[PDB]
Amino acid sequence: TPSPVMVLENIEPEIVYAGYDSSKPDTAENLLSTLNRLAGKQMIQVVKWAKVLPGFKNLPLEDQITLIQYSWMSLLSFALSWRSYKHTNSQFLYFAPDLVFNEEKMHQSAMYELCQGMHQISLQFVRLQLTFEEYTIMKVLLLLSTIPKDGLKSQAAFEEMRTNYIKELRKMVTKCPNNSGQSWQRFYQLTKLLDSMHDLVSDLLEFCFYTFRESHALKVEFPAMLVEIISDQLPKVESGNVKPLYFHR
Ligand SMILES: C[C@@H]1OC(=O)C(c2ccc(F)cc2)=C1c1ccc2c(c1)NC(=O)CO2
Numbered sequence: 401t402p403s404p405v406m407v408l409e410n411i412e413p414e415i416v417y418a419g420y421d422s423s424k425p426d427t428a429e430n431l432l433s434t435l436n437r438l439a440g441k442q443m444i445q446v447v448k449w450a451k452v453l454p455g456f457k458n459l460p461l462e463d464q465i466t467l468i469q470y471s472w473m474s475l476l477s478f479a480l481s482w483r484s485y486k487h488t489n490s491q492f493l494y495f496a497p498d499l500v501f502n503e504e505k506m507h508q509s510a511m512y513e514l515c516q517g518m519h520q521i522s523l524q525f526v527r528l529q530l531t532f533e534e535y536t537i538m539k540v541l542l543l544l545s546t547i548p549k550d551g552l553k554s555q556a557a558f559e560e561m562r563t564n565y566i567k568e569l570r571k572m573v574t575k576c577p578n579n580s581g582q583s584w585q586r587f588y589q590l591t592k593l594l595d596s597m598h599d600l601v602s603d604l605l606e607f608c609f610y611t612f613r614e615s616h617a618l619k620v621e622f623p624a625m626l627v628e629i630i631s632d633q634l635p636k637v638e639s640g641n642v643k644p645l646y647f648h649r
Pocket residue numbers: 432433435436439473476477480511514515516517518519604605607608609611612620
C-alpha cells in the first residue's frame with residue numbers, strides 16, 4: 401500500500417554523530433580523519449538503505465555494488481546539503497550535530513574551495529525551497545547518475561529503474577499545487593541542479609583520491625568502509641571507466 405515516496409521517508413537514514421574530539425587540535429589531519437570516519441559510518445547506512453530502496457533489488461547484485469561505489473560521494477554530498485539547509489538554513493555545512501563547519505573550519509580542513517562549492521548547492525536549496533520529497537527522489541537519481549563506461553551487467557534493469565525515478569520526480573513536481581504555472585520550469589531547475597553535482601563531486605573525489613593514496617605520508621586516516629570503496633573504485637577511475645549521465649549535456 402505505501403507509495404515509493406512513503407517508503408523513501410521510512411528508510412531515510414537517521415542522522416549520526418562524527419565522534420568529534422574537542423581535546424584534539426583542529427589540524428587538517430585531525431579534521432579530515434574525523435570526516436572520513438563520519439563518512440564511513442554514513443556509508444554503512446547507505447548500504448542498508450540501498451537494500452530496501454524500491455526497485456534496487458531488481459538490479460543484479462554486482463550492479464548494486466557498482467552503483468554505490470560510483471555514486472557514494474554524490475550521495476554524501478547531497479545529504480550534507482540537505483542537513484545544512486534543514487538544520488541551519490544553509491548558513492553552515494552541517495556534517496553532523498558535533499561537526500558543523502563555518503568558514504574557519506573550511507580553511508582548517510584544507511578544503512576551503514571544495515566546501516565553498518558545496519555551500520553553493522545548499523544555497524540553491526534555499527532559493528528553490530527544496531522539499532523533503534524532492535530531496536529523497538533526487539538522491540535516488542544520484543545513485544543512478546554515474547555508470548561504468550564498459551557496461552552494467554543489466555542495462556535494461558538499470559534503465560527501467562532510472563526511468564521510473566525520473567517519472568516519479570516529474571509527476572510529483574508537475575502535479576503539486578504549489579508549483580502551478582511553473583512546474584516544468586521547476587523540474588528543469590532540479591535536473592540542472594543534479595547535473596551540477598557531477599562537477600563538484602569530481603573535484604571532491606580527486607582530492608579524496610589524493611589523500612587516500614598519500615594517506616600514511618599525510619597522516620590522514622580512512623576507515624575500512626572507505627578503504628573498500630576507494631580500493632575498488634580508484635582503478636576504474638584511473639582506467640577511464642566512468643560515464644557521468646547528464647539531463648542537459
Ligand atoms: C567523504 C566525506 O563525506 C563528505 O560529506 C565529504 C565532503 C566534504 C566537503 C564537501 F564540500 C562535501 C562533501 C567528504 C570528503 C570529501 C573530500 C575528502 C574527504 C572527505 N577526505 C579526505 O581525506 C580529503 O578529501
